[PDB]
Every structure is written in C-alpha cells, then in structure tokens.
Amino acid sequence: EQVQDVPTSTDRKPTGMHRGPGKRQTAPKEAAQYQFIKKWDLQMRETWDELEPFKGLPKPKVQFGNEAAEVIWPYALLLENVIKVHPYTKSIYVYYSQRQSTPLGELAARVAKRVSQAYLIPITFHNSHVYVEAEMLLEYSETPWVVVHCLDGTHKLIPVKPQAGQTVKEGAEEVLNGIVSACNEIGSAVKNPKEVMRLLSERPLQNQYVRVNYQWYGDTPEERMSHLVKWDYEPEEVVPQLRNRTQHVLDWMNYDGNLPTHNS
Amino acid sequence: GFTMKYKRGTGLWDEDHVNDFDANKYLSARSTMRWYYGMERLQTRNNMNARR
Amino acid sequence: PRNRYEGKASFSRLSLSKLLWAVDTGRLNPNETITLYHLRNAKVIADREVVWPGMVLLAGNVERVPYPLHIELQNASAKAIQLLEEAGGSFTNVYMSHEGLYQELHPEEFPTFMEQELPERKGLENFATNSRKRGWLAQWYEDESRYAHPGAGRRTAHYIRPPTDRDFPATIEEYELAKHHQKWHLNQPGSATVLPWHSLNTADMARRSAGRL
Amino acid sequence: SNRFFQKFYLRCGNCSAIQRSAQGYQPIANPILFKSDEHCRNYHDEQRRAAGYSGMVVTCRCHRCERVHSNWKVLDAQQFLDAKLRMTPEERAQRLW
Amino acid sequence: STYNEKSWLEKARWGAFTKGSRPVMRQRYSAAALKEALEMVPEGFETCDVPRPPQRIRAQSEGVVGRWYTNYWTLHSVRYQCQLAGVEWQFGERQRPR
Amino acid sequence: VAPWVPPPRHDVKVTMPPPPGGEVGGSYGVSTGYSDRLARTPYWKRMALSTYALRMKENETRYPMSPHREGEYDLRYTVTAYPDHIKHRPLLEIGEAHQIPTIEIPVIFLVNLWDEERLTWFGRQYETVYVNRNVAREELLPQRYAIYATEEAYKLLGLPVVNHSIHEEIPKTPHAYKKLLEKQSYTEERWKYTIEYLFRKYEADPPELQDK
Amino acid sequence: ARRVQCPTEWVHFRMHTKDKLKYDFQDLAFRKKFEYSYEDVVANAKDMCS
Amino acid sequence: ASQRWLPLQTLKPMGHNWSAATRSSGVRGPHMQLMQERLDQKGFGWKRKSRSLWQQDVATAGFRPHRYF
Amino acid sequence: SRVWVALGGKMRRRRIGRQIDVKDMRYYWRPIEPQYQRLYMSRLRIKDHSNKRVQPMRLRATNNDIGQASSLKEWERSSDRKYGAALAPPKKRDFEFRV
Amino acid sequence: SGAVGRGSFHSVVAGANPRRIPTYYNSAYELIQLHRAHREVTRNFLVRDKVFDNKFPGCSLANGLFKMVPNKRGNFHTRELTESIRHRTIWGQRIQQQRTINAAILEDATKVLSPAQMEDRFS
Amino acid sequence: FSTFALNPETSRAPHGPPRGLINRYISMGLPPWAAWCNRVNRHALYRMSDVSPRSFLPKAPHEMDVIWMNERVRERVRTSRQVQHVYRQLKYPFVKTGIHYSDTLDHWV
Amino acid sequence: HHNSSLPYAKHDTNNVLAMRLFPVNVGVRARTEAIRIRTDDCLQRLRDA
Amino acid sequence: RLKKRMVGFIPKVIPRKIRNNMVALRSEANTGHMEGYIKTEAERLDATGRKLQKTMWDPVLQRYTLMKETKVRGPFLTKSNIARKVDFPVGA
RNA sequence: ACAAAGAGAACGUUUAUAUGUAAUUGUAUGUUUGAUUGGGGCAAUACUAUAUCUAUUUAUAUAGAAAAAGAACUAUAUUU
C-alpha cells in the first residue's frame, strides 16, 4: 500500500532478558504504528491514494460537477439516505451553472450542488438502474435543471425551483419530492410495459463506480448486503385457496345421540 | 423414577395396581384382616399424605 | 448399507392381501375411506408396525380387487395403486409429518383441528406432491405452489417474494460472482444463477435421480 | 451464528423510539475445513446476543430519527409492555410504530 | 453448593421444564369465567408482542393473575380455551415475521 | 445458637411469599421463597387484610423478568436459582488469548488543560475527550483535571446527558476493536460523516479552473 | 444467623429425601415449612366436599 | 379414460456421487458428519485440530491406541 | 438363511498392475463364509439364551421391532418417542424457539 | 384425522368418493368394540368417583373424601375419561352412520323380488 | 451450514433443518465442541450444555479478598499434542494491582 | 493389460444392446437403473403382444 | 509400531516404484477418465522424451480416444483441461 | 522453566510456538538358540526349516490422496 515497508524491528527493549526465538522483531501493534505514521507523511506529500481498495471498480467519468463519485462514501451513511425511485427511470442528470448572477440564482445552484452531492449518489447505490451523473456548466445560468430520463427512452425536465425564504437544507427535499414524484409519474405515464420489463431486467449495474467505505461492515458479504436484507414483520398475505369438503358435508352434526334418553 | 403413578387409584378395587410382592399362599385369619386393612391404609395413607 | 437416518422413508409393508382379507372378514368397513386409524383400531395392524411414516400398500399376489375400495395410506406400490384404480376405487396417498401421524391415530385427544405441518421437503418431492402416488398435495402443488410470484423474474423464481425491484444481480459482489460463474461453467442458459460447487451428499437433498414417471 | 430466531425491542436514546430489530438465521461457518477461532467465538458470541445483547454495542438505524447510531437500550419484552401499555394512545403513534 | 435445589437428573430432563407436548395451565375456566378474564386485557395490547421465553426459562403459567396477559403461556393458553368456549379472540394472532 | 432468627428478606406484601433470596440480595440456590409470617396467618386473615384490587397488584406476574433485579430473568424460573451465567460472563472465555488491546475512554475535562509539549489542548473545559485508559486513571483523574464521561457524571455537572456507552462492550481482539472504533467514530464524532465534511475538497471550483 | 446452627451433615435427613420440598432451604435454614395436621387436611378437603 | 400422456422414465443428466472405490464417498444422513467434517484436509486431521479447540468436554476423543480395537 | 454379504477385500489399496479380471472380483456382494457368520451372529443370539424358540437379534433394526419397544403397555402414555420420533424427521418448533 | 368415513382433511386434494350407498354392512365387529368401549367409559366413571368407605376404624378418618387427590381426579377426568368418551363416541358414529345406509338398503332391496327372500339375501 | 457464497439473513433455515454434524449440536444449544465427545451420555450433554458451570472460587466467598467480579477458576480441558492425551487444568483470571484514585478519600488507594 | 474394458466376450452384463442406444450424458449408476426401466417396458410390450 | 521399512525380501528393483514407471494415462478428451499404466521397459528407460500417448477405450464416451500420460496423483479435470471455444464447420 | 504476544507492559494471567528423562505413561517379540518372517519349486503331489534355490508373484481396512466405469501411500507382507 506504499506504507508496507515496515521495519522488521522496533525500539522496544525485548522483555525476556535471557534469550530465544522471536526476540527483537516487529509486533502487529507496532506494525500498525509505522503504518499510520508513514501514512500521514505521505498524506502531507499528497502521494497517499485512497483508490487502493477500489481498484476493480470502473473509475467514474471525471467531470466538474461529478465529484460526487470520487468521494469515498460511508456505508453507514448510504444506509441513512435510503431514496428509492420508480424502477423504469433509467437515469438522472443534474446540471447547474458555475457562477450564478442573481441572488436567487445562487440559491438554486446551492440546492442543485447540494442535491448534486446529498441525494443523487444514494439513489444510484440503492436503485442501481439509474445512472446518476452531475455536470457543472460554466456560465451565469441562474437556474439549474434535472433531466430525469425513463426506460422507454422518454425523459422530462425538473426545473430546480427553490423558494426564496427556504434554506437549501430543504430546497433539495423539495427537489427530491419534485423528482421522485416525476419518476413515478413518468413511470405511471409510460406506454406498453412489456418492453421496459425486459430492459429493466437487462440494464446492467450503473452504480459500479460508487466508492463505499464499508465501516464495521467488513465481516462477510452477508453484511455487505445488509441494506438489501429488509426485515418485514407482520407480513400480510390473506388470500387462501380454500378447499371445502364436498362429500358427506353434513353428518358431523347428525350423529351420537349421547346416551339415548327415556324415549329410546 | 417413572412408576405408572397414573394407575394408583385408577383400578377397580383397592388391591389393584399396587405392587406387593410380599404375599403368601395361605394368609390366615388375622393375616387377612391385616391384609385388607393394609391395602386401604396405604391407599388412604398415600392420599392424605398427598393432600397434606 | 441399510442405515436409517433421521428422516428416512422406510415403511412397514401392509400387504394388500391383508387389507383385502380384512374388508371381507368384517373388521374394516368398505364404505368409510379406510385411513390408518381404522387399520390400527380394528386390530388389523398393531402398535409395533406403525412407525413413521405409516405404511406401504403392496399388491402381494393380489391379481384382482373386486369392490370399489377407498384408502388413505402412505405410498402404495404402483401395482397396488393400479389395482384399486381399476375397480373404481381411490388411493390418495397421505404423507403426513410425524406430528400428523399422531393426530391421526389418537384424535380422541385432539378436540379441535390443531394445524398440521406439511411433511419434510424430501417427502414432498417423492410422495406428498407426486401425482404418481396420487399424493394429497398433487392437487395443490400444480394448482397453487408450482407458480412463482407474480413479480419474480428468472433469478428469484424461488423466493417467497422477489427480494429486489429487478431480477438482475443487485450489487457488485452478487454480480462479479455471477459474472465469473456464468463463465466458470461454460456459458449455459441458466448458469447465471450462482450455485455452491460442493455437494453435501445429504439424504435430504436427494431426490429420485433415475426412475419411472 | 445465529441459528435460532429472536426479535429484540431496541429503545433509542435520542428519541426513545422503541423499534424492534430481529435476528435471522445465519449459518455456521463451514465445519468441513474447521477453524477453531472463528467457531468458538461465533458460539460464545451467540450467547451474548441471546442474552439480550449483553456485551455488544447495538448498531441499528432508527425509524424515527432516520440515522444509524449506537445508543439503543435493549428492552426485554416485559420491560417493553411495561412501557407500551403505559403510553397514551397518541404517543404510541410517536414512540412505537 | 452444600444444597442443590434439584439434582442434575432434573436439571437435565427438559421435559419437566420445557413447554413441549405438556400443558402448562392447570385450571380450565368456564364461559363466563373467561369473558371476565379478558376484561382486564388492556386497550393497546396485542399478542404480537409477548414473546416466547427461551428454553432456559421454565414453562410455568401461574394462572390468571394480575397482568396475566404478559405471561406468554397464560396468554396462549387462555387464548385456547376461548376457542373451545367459543369466545371471540379480538386481539391479534402470532405474527411470524419474515 | 440463633436468638432472633432474622425475618425473610423481602416479606413486605400481605398475601404472597417474599421473593427468593439472591434476587433480594442474599444466597442463591433456592427457587421458591417462603416466610413463616405468611404461612401461619390463616387464609381469612390473609383475605381480611387485602382487597381484591390489591391482590391483582401482587398476584402480578412479571413472568420471565424479575421485578427486583431489573433487567435479569426471574431466578425462580431459570434452570437453577443462581444468577444468569450468560449475561455476567467473565471477559475471557475458557480458551481465548488475552489480546484485549489498548482502549481509550472518554473523560470530561474539568479545567482548560493545555499541553506544553505538543503546545495544544489535552482538552477544553467541560468537553469529553477520548483519552488513554492509563492516562486517565493515572494522570488525569488523580489531579482534578478530569472525571469519567458516564451518564450521571453529565448529570452532576450540568451537561446534556450524553451516552458514550462507556465500555458498553469491550473488544477482545484488535480487529474486533478497530471495528468498534468505527462504530464510535460515527456516533460520537459525527461531523466526520456529513455531506458537508465529505466535500470540503469541493465547496468551490474544482481546483483545475482557479487562478494562480 | 439465617443458617441452621449445625454442620449440615447432621441434618442431611432434610436435603436428600422428599423433605427437599417440605422444608425452607433458603441459605441453609433447614426449618420446616407450614404443614397442616391431619385434623385439618380432612377439615379442608371435606368442607370442599372433594 | 383421460388421454393424458407421460413418458416412461425421467432421464436426468446427473452423475452418481458414490463410487465403490472412493473412500468417503456416499450419501450421508442429514446429521452424519459431512464428508471430511472437522478434518480440515488432513488424515485424521480432526484429532490434530483438537488442541486448537478452545475448551472441550471432559470426555473428548482422548488417547485410544487400537488395542483389540 | 441369512447371509452376511460383504464387499471385496482389495478394492481401494493397490490397483495399477493387478490382474485385469481380478480387479473386479472385489465388486460383488460375496457372502462371508459361515465360519464367521456363526462367530459374529453369536453375540446376537445371547439375547435370551436357553429359550429355544426366540430368534437371534438381527443386524439392522427391522421396522417392526423398533416400535415393539414403544408397543409395550407401559409406553402407551408417552406421546413423544412413540410411533417413531427418533427416526422421525427432525422436530419442528415455534419460529421463536430459542435457547 | 380420519377415524370415520368423512375422510381426513387429507382430502385436501379434492378426492371425491363416488359409487356410494353401495354396501349393507351389519357393523358386527364395530358393535363389539362399542360394547367393549362402553364398558370402559363406565369402568372409568366408577374410578373417577371412588370415595373412601373405610370398613376399618383404624384409618376411618378419611371416610368422606374421594380416593384421588383433587388435582389428579381433575386431571384423570380430562386425560383418560374424557378421552374414552370420544373413543366411545367414535364407535357410536361409525355405527350410527353405517346403519343409516342399511336403513336405505333394506328398503330399496325389500321391494324388488321378495320380502321373504330379502332377509335371506342379507343373511 | 450452507454452501452458497452469499447467504443473506433470513427468518428460518432456508434449506431445511441445518445439515451436518456440528449443526446437530448447535440445533440443541450445545457448543461446537460437542463434536469431539466420544460419549455423549445424558449427563454429558448436561455437563457440556453449561446448565450450571463447573467453576468455583479460589477461597471461600465469605473469606475472599481480591476483587473477583464475576469469575471462577474455570478448568480448560486440553487435548495434548501428537498423541492426543486429554488433560485438564484450572485457568485463573488476571488480577491487576488496582492503584486507583478514589476522589472520595482524596488519595490513591 | 492395463485396460479397463475388455471387449464384449460372453458376459451377461448390462443390456449392451441398450448401452449403445443410450445418452452418455447420464452417469453410470443412473444409467444401469435406466436401461432396465427401458427394458422393463420392453418386457411388458413383449408380454402384451 | 516402528518397523516402518520392512526387511524380509527387500526386492531388487520393483517395477511399480521408479521415477515415472506408473503413469496415469488420462484421456485427452477431458472426460476426467484415467487408466493407470506402468510404462514397460520399452519406455521405462527414457526411450521417450515425448510424454507417452496411447489409444484406449474411453469408457465414459464409449469411444476410442487419446490417452496422454500424466502423474497419477492430481485432479484429473482442472481449469487447465478446458478447451477454448470454437465454432465447428457445421451450422449456419 | 526458556522465548513471543496481549495489557501506556504495576509485577500475579491468558495464549501461541515449544516439548526436558527434572517426566512417575507404555513399548523394548516371535520363532528356531544370535538368524530368519515372503510366494513358489525341486527333492517318495510327506516337510521340522530338512536340503536347495528363485522373483513386479503383488502388503486387506480405517482418515487423508483420486468424484462416474479409472487411482496413489504403509505397517515382522494376516497387517490388532
């Protein structure tokens, strides 16, 4: 990892004065010391890389608004922001200007760039059909837009319109309810579904680039699938195929006159 | 251990389902009074024991 | 060479001659579908011969059955079935779990219907759902079970409900595992579904590899 | 590990939202190529969950405050009824489900 | 321990301990003696919550007493005499989670 | 000889035996409590001193749990009356190696403490710091610079009650600890995991488009 | 003080037989529980007409 | 009768998993020790893995040289 | 007439180079010669000696005698362990069953 | 459960049973095991009500109580007695059902050829 | 025990009651070291199910001195090296010199 | 020598007439159990005629 | 027991044990078959630098196929005995 | 006991790797007298070892090794 040149020794005076095998050589507590110390000294030389684990993942398309991909995301964070969209939406693009002239234009781009960072990449990781991508345009475009596509090839625009008084910490939440609304509305207003039921069940994984720091989830791919495992207590399926008893349907209520009375 | 305790009183008389190997061929006059009084005793000796 | 593990399908043989001998003798009533309660309570078979699972009807030298005879037994032999079925009878092979074996022999201890669990998976493979024995689930299996969930794709045809909103592999390690498997096995049609390449050699996961149909 | 099913009733510390989180059936590490450390600490750890998360930090995501933390107090299900039965019918909509 | 409450023979016979094929509620109440037990099942209660105690806990229903509905064995035994009696079990059934 | 044999421990209820010893604080090993005060008073007496509304409060069955030892199963229903072995297990099982690594605990500093060697702050006043387990015990606590960061320590000082889960679980292996560091890095120092801190790198222009 | 005041090898009559039930055994106080007399076992089981 | 048609036999391209000349081959019971259970790839290796066990029972597969075994 | 048929002697150790038509005499269920039939089946006869009309114990447990133990007038009250519970499939428990 | 001709619930498969009312059966063996079973339920009530008649004055002091502890008698009534009534009822139906058929057979048969040969045809 | 690569958690045994020998002793609460017993008598699966631990205190509890919180001297049955002899030994806990500062009595103790 | 399958000499082994006509796909112990269920039918067809 | 190496009739030579005298003629048709074969003196001595080959009934295929020699110890169908795919001169 | 590791290593424990005649366990043969142990053959279709010699004359099982029909390792070569 570039820090694996641990000196196979350590300053510590060897306990066990006498003699024997295993003396004066590194310990797995000391091997983690030098690993951290010489990790920091790179992290000052800036040569230290964090794409050492994420070597198989296809390196995301670099772009100036697409820094959301190169971030190593905490798996305990992508669990919190569990956003889901209608499955027939193939992609989401969120473009926004670089510098925004009007004061309310800088408001929206803040929301876009926020939603470009906060809510877009969880949707990728959670839904895995959508190809979430964000690009920062370069001009005084005081309004960002969102291109919510769909599997049928159709698509819409979602003019990112936050209110002047609101913050951006909810301006996205509005935009969120402005996208996940459309996604179902587009997916409800689709044409014949037999085709998109094939593409969707053919669309490869779009979220491969996503870099998830599986923190305290490193035991086995069982817990790496912990966001797909979804407990469902009180599950309800009350539609039984009842098979009634046609032959001798009566005759349960007509027998064993218990201990025949005085007449018989 | 398990000794068929659900059979102690579930016999038709008092001398039944009580294992008494101590028998004899001819139980005499007072050995028979001793016997009949015996079966009922360890039938009421058992009960009021188990009731107390 | 003849071991009996926990769950073996080894029946005690009730020769059809015995059952046919009784029905005329008068121990068994030909009207009432002769479930194993009647056989046990009429002293046709004792306690020392009904060990789970119940019995097996064997057409032993019985070249003919004269009257329409109805039976609810466990795993009749194929000839014994085609003998009752010729004389207008029936044979609906009940293959009850052990919990069902009790509540059929001593129902005077179960005042109400205490629900019965379906038999072991090994039994459902061979008797309970197999129409060759007219197992009692050969109606249900084709009617309700053999159909997948109305949302399941190709990979999740066996889950009670498709665990994803899309048939395809969910995450990377479910994918690269299936991207390697489908070319680990030479590219077969269904080889997409990753399978464990180690055979436990258990008797439960054993179903008739060769046999009649 | 785990072999038997059990559902706990975890009480958050931030909102005290008594949410229940179960523990499914996760099969034993393979005995065919046995490994003494991974097994005997799978088992000993299993008594520690089976006794209501004795020596473990509980890490499940809340349902009320949507976030994952480690602040849950594992309620034995007669300390839960002590709590559930003693909440006005409106706060049962607030803290319970 | 100089005195053991029970010899190992009865630390190792779970049949006297577990609830398996063994009734754990002795008294069988009448019709009106149940409609007067369920009167104290409080509103907000649901059988879907009182769980099965583990094996290591004895199977003992001390009967219908104060807060009997939390005794998992008293609850599901009363719930069963309400069947043989015909009383209408309002509360929910054991929801086997999946 | 015993003049005045003491009365049973928790005999305070009028028509039910006192809970077994051990549960009240005494000697374990016996399941069923019994108090000769209760068994001698005839039945009508026990029904005199009590009304029906009360017996339903002391009949009360707290079935698995114990009403007294809060959080532990009632010791008249366990396999044997001793305390639950499983909950109070010794930290080392019968075979494992003692590789319990160095653990750092949270302490509430009580005076603005300022190191003169790193020239920075061990800790501000009234802020909880994760310090070594043998700095705290040996250097921070004996002098009055710090105390532990327990729940009640917060209560005594005037701070919003925070649950650090101080030693809620000890890790018996380094990599079993370096997972616990990842849990505690999330709950305690949460600002590390905001969408704003994962993007200090990018709050403005991607650096390749700025001046020089 | 709650203990019984003799080495329990002398009072082993109580610990192994079916006196394990008829006796208080809390912290080795081998003292008899309450026990009805036979004038009462029938006074309490006839008044019920059992 | 019903004119329904079914073949005479089911041909499965499956291969038998018990070869008479292979040692641990067979169909084992659902609770027998699966093929080479506890062995860990070594001859009688489940013995060598006993010292590795954390704690064993008081009566645990001890010394027993096959004498009149 | 109860043979105790046993498999071939040399069927796993050394195969390469042995005769071509004797590498298969190892495959038949041959009887063991009666001089050993009587030795091994001697430990089974002892079950009730001097009773000239009880047959020897069998090698495998025949299906009717297993129940013969629980077909005794004293076992009629053990619902469990009757009608075959060991050789039954593994019991099924409450989904909450736990130890 | 089976135990009568109604078919156990294992007619989940809708196995019908046609060609019925086909057999006159005198219920010979079943009436035998009824008189045997009716003797048990009465031979059980005799036990459930055994009450001390101590013909001796030594242990006369229980001459009013039942011969079984109240908890046990309260069990044996429910374990063995009330079971034996169900087992008696079962035969009280497997016969009351089979008679219903015979009542129908012995009419449709009496007509055809003879009311004299009839109880010879069914002899 | 199942053989698939990725076994997602589930309510019940997905493929029937878990097969294998060691799954047989876990299905009854025992620990996986029961697989190494030669005799599993009704006392044995009692002995090793840890109903009541075979584990005691070095001195009398009424006369104990060093603060043993919840510990015993549990005996660890070891099986020896190449020739597997079974021997057992009593393993203690690790007592440290607890040199604390109880600020009640403003001094180390 | 050092062969395993000596040519068909006079031995009444499995139905070699049907060992030729059968899919090699199936394993052995599942073939010799299936050339018989083929032959078992060829025996019924012959008896009926 | 000791006595690990026997001493009565230590045979001069011994055909089965010689650097490659017993060879598993595994089938070139990667059906996993093998037919253990001791190289005779015609190949015991290195008359063959080439790895032995023979035509033998492949009992699986029921066809005479090649038998390339190979050490008798080893898995006989490894991921090296996969043949690269090829489109046959048949088909459209 | 020696060494490793873990505890800001305040000292007691637990491990791992090691196995000490300080270690008290068990083996240390059998047959003819000190050598021999195998399967054949010639010596009246006798064979004590008699007398001679030969040689792919083969080392059964159980765990591992080879997973289709095919296969390896070793034991006074009946082999506790």
Ligand SMILES: NC(=O)c1ccc[n+]([C@@H]2O[C@H](COP(=O)([O-])OP(=O)(O)OC[C@H]3O[C@@H](n4cnc5c(N)ncnc54)[C@H](O)[C@@H]3O)[C@@H](O)[C@H]2O)c1
């Ligand atoms: N293998 C078995 O478990 C088994 C065997 C024989 C009988 N049973 C039947 O089980 C029934 C009880 O149900 P379960 O098996 O779930 O266990 P259970 O006995 O715990 O059932 C709950 C409770 O129902 C009550 N009850 C049972 N039968 C009753 C009756 N006839 N009238 C009134 N109350 C009654 C008892 O209090 C019992 O404890 C009994 O009626 C019994 O005859 C079960």
Ligand SMILES: [Zn+2]
């Ligand atoms: Zn919360």
